[PDB]
Amino acid sequence: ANVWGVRLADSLSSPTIETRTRHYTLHDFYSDLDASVGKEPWRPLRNQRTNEI
Amino acid sequence: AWPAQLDFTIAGTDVDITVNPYYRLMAFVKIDGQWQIANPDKFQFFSSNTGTLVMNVKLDIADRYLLYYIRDVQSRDVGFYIQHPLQLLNTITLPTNEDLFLSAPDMREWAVKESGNTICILNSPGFIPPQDWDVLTDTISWSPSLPTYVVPPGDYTLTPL
Amino acid sequence: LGMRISALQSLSDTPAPVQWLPQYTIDQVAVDEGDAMVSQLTQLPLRPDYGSIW
Amino acid sequence: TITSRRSPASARRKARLRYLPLIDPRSLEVQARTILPSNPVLFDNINGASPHVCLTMMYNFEVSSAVYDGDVVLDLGTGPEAKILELIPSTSPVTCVDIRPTAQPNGCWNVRTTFLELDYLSDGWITGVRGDIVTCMLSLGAAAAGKSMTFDAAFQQLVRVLTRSTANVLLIQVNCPTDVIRTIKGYLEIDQTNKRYKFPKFGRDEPYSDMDSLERICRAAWPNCSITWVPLSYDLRWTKLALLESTTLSSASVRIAELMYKYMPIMRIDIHGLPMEKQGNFIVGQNCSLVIPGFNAQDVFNCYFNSALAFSTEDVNSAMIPQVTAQFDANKGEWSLDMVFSDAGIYTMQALVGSNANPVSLGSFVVDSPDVDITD
Amino acid sequence: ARSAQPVTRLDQCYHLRWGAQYVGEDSLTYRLGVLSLLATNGYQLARPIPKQLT
Amino acid sequence: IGEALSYYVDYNRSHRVVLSSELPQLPDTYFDGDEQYGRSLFSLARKVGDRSLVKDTAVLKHAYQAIDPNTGKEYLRAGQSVAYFGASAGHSGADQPLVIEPWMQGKISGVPPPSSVRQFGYDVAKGAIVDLARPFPSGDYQFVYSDVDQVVDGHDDLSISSGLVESLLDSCVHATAPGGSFVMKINFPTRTVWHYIEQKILPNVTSYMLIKPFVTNNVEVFFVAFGVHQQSALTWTSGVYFFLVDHFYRYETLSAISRQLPSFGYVDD
Numbered sequence A: 001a002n003v004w005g006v007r008l009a010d011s012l013s014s015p016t017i018e019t020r021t022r023h024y025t026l027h028d029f030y031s032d033l034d035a036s037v038g039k040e041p042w043r044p045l046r047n048q049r050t051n052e053i
Numbered sequence B: 001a002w003p004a005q006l007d008f009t010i011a012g013t014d015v016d017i018t019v020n021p022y023y024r025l026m027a028f029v030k031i032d033g034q035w036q037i038a039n040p041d042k043f044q045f046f047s048s049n050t051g052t053l054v055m056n057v058k059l060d061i062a063d064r065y066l067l068y069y070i071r072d073v074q075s076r077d078v079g080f081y082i083q084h085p086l087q088l089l090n091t092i093t094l095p096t097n098e099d100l101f102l103s104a105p106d107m108r109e110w111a112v113k114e115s116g117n118t119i120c121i122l123n124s125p126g127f128i129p130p131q132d133w134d135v136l137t138d139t140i141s142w143s144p145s146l147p148t149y150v151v152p153p154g155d156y157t158l159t160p161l
Numbered sequence C: 001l002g003m004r005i006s007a008l009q010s011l012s013d014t015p016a017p018v019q020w021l022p023q024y025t026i027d028q029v030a031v032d033e034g035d036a037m038v039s040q041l042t043q044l045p046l047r048p049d050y051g052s053i054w
Numbered sequence D: 001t002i003t004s005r006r007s008p009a010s011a012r013r014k015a016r017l018r019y020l021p022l023i024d025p026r027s028l029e030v031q032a033r034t035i036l037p038s039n040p041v042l043f044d045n046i047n048g049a050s051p052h053v054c055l056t057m058m059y060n061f062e063v064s065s066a067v068y069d070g071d072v073v074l075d076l077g078t079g080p081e082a083k084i085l086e087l088i089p090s091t092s093p094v095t096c097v098d099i100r101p102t103a104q105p106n107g108c109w110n111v112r113t114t115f116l117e118l119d120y121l122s123d124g125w126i127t128g129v130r131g132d133i134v135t136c137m138l139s140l141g142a143a144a145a146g147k148s149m150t151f152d153a154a155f156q157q158l159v160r161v162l163t164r165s166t167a168n169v170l171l172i173q174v175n176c177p178t179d180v181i182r183t184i185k186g187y188l189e190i191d192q193t194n195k196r197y198k199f200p201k202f203g204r205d206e207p208y209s210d211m212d213s214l215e216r217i218c219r220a221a222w223p224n225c226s227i228t229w230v231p232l233s234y235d236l237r238w239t240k241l242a243l244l245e246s247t248t249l250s251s252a253s254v255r256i257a258e259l260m261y262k263y264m265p266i267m268r269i270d271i272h273g274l275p276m277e278k279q280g281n282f283i284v285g286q287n288c289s290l291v292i293p294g295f296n297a298q299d300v301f302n303c304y305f306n307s308a309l310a311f312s313t314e315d316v317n318s319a320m321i322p323q324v325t326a327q328f329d330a331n332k333g334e335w336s337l338d339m340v341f342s343d344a345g346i347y348t349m350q351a352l353v354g355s356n357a358n359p360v361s362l363g364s365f366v367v368d369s370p371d372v373d374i375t376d
Numbered sequence E: 001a002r003s004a005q006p007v008t009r010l011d012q013c014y015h016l017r018w019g020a021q022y023v024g025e026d027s028l029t030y031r032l033g034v035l036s037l038l039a040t041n042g043y044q045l046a047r048p049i050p051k052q053l054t
Numbered sequence F: 001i002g003e004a005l006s007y008y009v010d011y012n013r014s015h016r017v018v019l020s021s022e023l024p025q026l027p028d029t030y031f032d033g034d035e036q037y038g039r040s041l042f043s044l045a046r047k048v049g050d051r052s053l054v055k056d057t058a059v060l061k062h063a064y065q066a067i068d069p070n071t072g073k074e075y076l077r078a079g080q081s082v083a084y085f086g087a088s089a090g091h092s093g094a095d096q097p098l099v100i101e102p103w104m105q106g107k108i109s110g111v112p113p114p115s116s117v118r119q120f121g122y123d124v125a126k127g128a129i130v131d132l133a134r135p136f137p138s139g140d141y142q143f144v145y146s147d148v149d150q151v152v153d154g155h156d157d158l159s160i161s162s163g164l165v166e167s168l169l170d171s172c173v174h175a176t177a178p179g180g181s182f183v184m185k186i187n188f189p190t191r192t193v194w195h196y197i198e199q200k201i202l203p204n205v206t207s208y209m210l211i212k213p214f215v216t217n218n219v220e221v222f223f224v225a226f227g228v229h230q231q232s233a234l235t236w237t238s239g240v241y242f243f244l245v246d247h248f249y250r251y252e253t254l255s256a257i258s259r260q261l262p263s264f265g266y267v268d269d
């Protein structure tokens, strides 16, 4: 183990695969700009007790 | 098949059988809907590959009332390929001159008869064994509760009850 | 870094205490030492719910 | 946090060990979870103990009362947890045997206690072992069922192997019905034909025997044995082991346990005892003679119905039976106790010694109910 | 991590580059730099971190 | 998608005798990067409910079919006083293995309900927690069903895992009520495990079978022994040989297939 608050000892892991970058095109810009029901450019965060945005 | 001569001793008799050695052939002497294999020392085989002189049976009066139905033994199922009774071992001419074993057929109060005098019932409640009848060290019967006796003079035609 | 490689394996939570069965080893210590240590770690001065004899 | 209760049995166990063992912390170190607490309660068990537990506690109390101080013992089939270590006093060697390997510490005990797994129902292991009293409770029927033999055969093998032993007193949990078979519903249904039990709460079953057969085997083993059938205590004296260690009783359960004890009694056997002749019937309403020789004109005897005294023989006019007499017969050196009883059951006949020392026990005997034969 | 599920980035930490001379021992920036180095090398917290922080 | 595929082979006294050294074992390249990639991909893409529930139902169905040779009826029956080694965490339903409720109520349609079910393991919620690789204070059970794995205590070492398998076989045979049966899982079948089982477990067992409910690509196998604490001469057979061959070869084929598919959340180009 611990630095000032105890961290998991006895094991150690990390990711292995990384996705390749995707260039951003005008079609993508337009599709993001006309926010459809399935994929908006935002995402609501809500409280953990009242369960409201 | 069995030889022309048979003895009633601790060594008993032995029969020969023709069958494919793939099987196991336990006894399974049934009495009711249940089967009650219940023959650890009554039957005994040497090596199924040869004739192996199967069924070293130790005969006693109970066989006269007991049909055996030699069955096959497998892992999942039992007696599925071959299952037939020992038809002529159902009935044997018992030599009254030589002593024999006196196991009981069933719990339902079977009465022993020597020559018609109606000896005391074997499975009678509160039974006292006669001094002549000797109890074998290991009872040769399907039920472990039933002991084994010896009856040298006559002692045939075990009457039902 | 002498530690092995494996993801965190977390057990589950339960709202009530669970029974435990101890198991013993070879090493030994002094009985008075154990009693002093349990006196250091104890929480005895509390009023428990009595219950019912019969 | 670790919660638990203590008990005088716990203190008696703690009085044995010299060095306190150390657990291995793996089972607690592995815990990477969250277990919410709860308020502590002294008598946590809200449904009360079960009848099996009550019967086991009756057995344990009987063992603890039988064992004295500074006596070498050996229990047959104790289990992974040596519960007997909490029963008998903390100043006596307690070498016990069981087929399954133990779970108790090794070393760090004041008085020597040894463990060993060797299938006690076998030949060639007792000649080296030492002991005075031997206890085998709730294990003999299990072994008989395991080896697939009859209870009488298993008992005879046990007695023949114990003949090699050096013990003198012997008390075991024999398996015999001492009353009209009732088949207690839901806990024990007896099979008249095959003579099995089929405990429905554990899916177990093992054979049993009868009193005359067991006594005949014991007599064939030793001629001077003094068989005695310990009676169940209606006075609830065994309740100490339950209440003093935080266990609720649940009276229906204790009643079921009392009903179930009569089919699984425990006989006590004294290898060095005093034989005594008897008659055939000993049925109530009829005369009953009894011969006991060689107590040199000091014959303070007292047979017990269950635990109360009856015919203390210091004055026959104060007995609790319809009639009783005694005579010395100096030429023969044997008393002829003839009396008539009024209640069927088992009597102890404690036979207080002709001296200031404690009483040396004699055998027990059962009296049969009245006959139903009448003629005018 | 699952060894068969790709991520959009192998490490998220920052690794403060220049201004460390202005922040020495027992400062939150220094301690967070140490923790970010540990997380990049592949350590794990003994306490489970929720899916939606609070 | 779907349920699990069951593959079993049970002992028969008529096939053949074969030494442990003649049996196949775990492949060498089993803990490699690409191998773990394939296994993890297949596990992620598998669509099933409770793996433990599926496995346990299949194993119990295939286990209540055996019948002993020493008698006629069968090994397992109703009211057996079972013990469940390796009880587990919550499963989004009850806080115990999801087989206990249906198997007590008599819902599996091939199993009679037992008398009671006691639980043990590090991650149990309604039973004691103990180290099952060592003796511990407990009663005796006519049927112990062990699901404890050799990963939590095996410190990422095949030899240590094999030794743990040996110790767990030893414990599970000490705690199994002479005349009953048990079920143990083997994560990493190796020739040391086969030799130990042949030398120590077979001579004290009446019959056995070993099954494999296929739900995810791996080489785990279950071992079921019947009628413990009874002398007998038993050995591995040609049936077990063929079973192990097909087992390992289908593992190899599915691994070679799954190591050619794309990742789980890949972006195609």
Ligand SMILES: C[S@@+](CC[C@H](N)C(=O)[O-])C[C@H]1O[C@@H](n2cnc3c(N)ncnc32)[C@H](O)[C@@H]1O
Pocket (backbone or CB within 6 Å): D075, D076, D077, D078, D079, D080, D083, D097, D098, D099, D100, D118, D119, D120, D121, D136, D137, D138, D139, D140, D142, D143, D144, D146, F139, F140
């Ligand atoms: C469940 S326990 C109860 C023991 C009880 N606490 C007592 O000692 O009074 C029954 C024990 O009897 C033992 N007993 C039954 N058959 C065994 C025999 N074949 N070998 C030695 N142990 C015998 C078993 O080892 C088992 O642990």
Ligand SMILES: C[S@@+](CC[C@H](N)C(=O)[O-])C[C@H]1O[C@@H](n2cnc3c(N)ncnc32)[C@H](O)[C@@H]1O
Pocket (backbone or CB within 6 Å): F052, F086, F087, F088, F089, F096, F097, F120, F121, F122, F123, F130, F131, F132, F133, F147, F148, F149, F150, F152, F153
């Ligand atoms: C993969 S799980 C099996 C879970 C099981 N299928 C279930 O759902 O109930 C293996 C479990 O066994 C436990 N375990 C592993 N090694 C053990 C040991 N030596 N003693 C006791 N429990 C152990 C672990 O805590 C883990 O929860």
